[PDB]
């Protein structure tokens, strides 16, 4: 139950903290009783095979805010009690597939803000047990395999926010997914099959996604959807019946969009009235035309614009 020189060991050596230190490598003599390890804010560059083999009881392992660029094969061997593994704010150029060793208890994996360039096929089929995955802020990402998320039949939260994404990737593997964060992407056009097989999804976020066009039927698959955020995008209108199938959708953010208020958006105003009736004049405003400018989309009706069948 010894404490390493550079760490502060609480309890009977269950909670070990080693932060704000100038650690170049992972310290030794970590007591076997450790269930929590915080090595955040250090200068660690490499993690080696069996570095943690002796820690049977480790549940939470925080290796974030470091310089980690190399994670050798079987680096996390010997950690069958491990739940959460944090690796954000590091210098990983690729996802550390090899490091994984069917860690059935692993539930959270945090990799945001790393210079990862691509997520290859079957990247996480050593860790099917994952519930939360954080792949946000991967600003040098250029490719996601179609089979990248295969095996993650238990994933519930995914974060692909702030990754330069011209297109939504294949997420048909993520059968049980509930929250998807796609904000801060270059998602220009949203085609009909963009969220195929995400029938379990409840919250979807597309804030600051440079979304100009949403084609008809683009959300048909999201049958469980409750919340949507299309705020701070470039939407001028939404296609007919975009929400008719989404029976449970109760919260929609539409603000900060150059909404053009003509009869193409008549349906939406009525959807707003039926779905969120307490909102009389707030807070999704028309930019065009003048005379309708500043007005809440959902306060408009048939007298405000001329309507045809084509
Ligand atoms: C409805 O009003 C609420 C309460 O202020 C606000 O948060 C929301 O932006 C409004 N919803 C829409 C769809 O404009």
Swiss-Prot record:
Q: Where is the LRRCT domain?
A: 257-309
Which residues carry attached sugars according to the database record?
Answer: 170, 229, 279
> Where does the record place its LRR repeats?
33-54, 57-78, 81-102, 105-126, 129-151, 154-175, 176-197, 200-221, 224-245
Q: Where is the LRRNT domain?
A: 1-32
| Function, as annotated | Synaptic adhesion protein. Regulates the formation of excitatory synapses. The trans-synaptic adhesion between LRRC4B and PTPRF regulates the formation of excitatory synapses in a bidirectional manner.
Per the record, the domain comment is: The extreme C-terminus binds to the first 2 PDZ domains of DLG4.
Spell out the protein name for this chain: Leucine-rich repeat-containing protein 4B
Lineage per the UniProt record: Eukaryota, Metazoa, Chordata, Craniata, Vertebrata
Q: Which gene encodes it?
A: Lrrc4b
| Included range, full protein | 57 to 365 of 709
């Amino acid at each position: 139950t010894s404490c390493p020189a550079a760490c502060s060991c609480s309890n009977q050596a269950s909670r070990v903290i080693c932060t704000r230190r100038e650690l170049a490598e992972v310290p030794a003599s970590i007591p076997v009783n450790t269930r929590y390890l915080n090595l955040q804010e250090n200068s660690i560059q490499v993690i080696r095979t069996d570095t943690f083999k002796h820690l049977r009881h480790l549940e939470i392992l925080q290796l974030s805010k470091n310089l980690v660029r190399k994670i050798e094969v079987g680096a996390f061997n010997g950690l069958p009690s491990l739940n959460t593994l944090e690796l954000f704010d590091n210098r990983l150029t690729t996802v550390p597939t090899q490091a994984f060793e069917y860690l059935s208890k692993l539930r959270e994996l945090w990799l945001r803000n790393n210079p990862i360039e691509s997520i290859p096929s079957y990247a996480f089929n050593r860790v099917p047990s994952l519930r939360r995955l954080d792949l946000g802020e991967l600003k040098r990402l250029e490719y996601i395999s179609e089979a990248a998320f295969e095996g993650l039949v238990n994933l519930r939260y995914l974060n692909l926010g702030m990754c330069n994404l011209k297109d939504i990737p294949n997420l048909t593997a993520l059968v049980r997914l509930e929250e998807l964060e796609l904000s801060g992407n270059r998602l220009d056009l949203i085609r009909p099959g963009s969220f195929q097989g995400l029938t379990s999804l409840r919250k979807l976020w597309l804030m600051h996604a440079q979304v100009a066009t949403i084609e008809r039927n683009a959300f048909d698959d999201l049958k469980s959807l409750e919340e949507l955020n299309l705020s701070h995008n470039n939407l001028m209108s939404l296609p007919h019946d975009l929400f008719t199938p989404l029976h449970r959708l109760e919260r929609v953010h539409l603000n900060h969009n150059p909404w053009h208020c003509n009869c193409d958006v008549l349906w939406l105003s009525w959807w707003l009235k039926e779905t969120v009736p307490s909102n009389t004049t707030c807070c999704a405003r028309c930019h065009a035309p003048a005379g309708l400018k500043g007005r809440y989309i959902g306060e408009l009706d048939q007298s405000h614009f001329t309507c045809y069948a084509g």
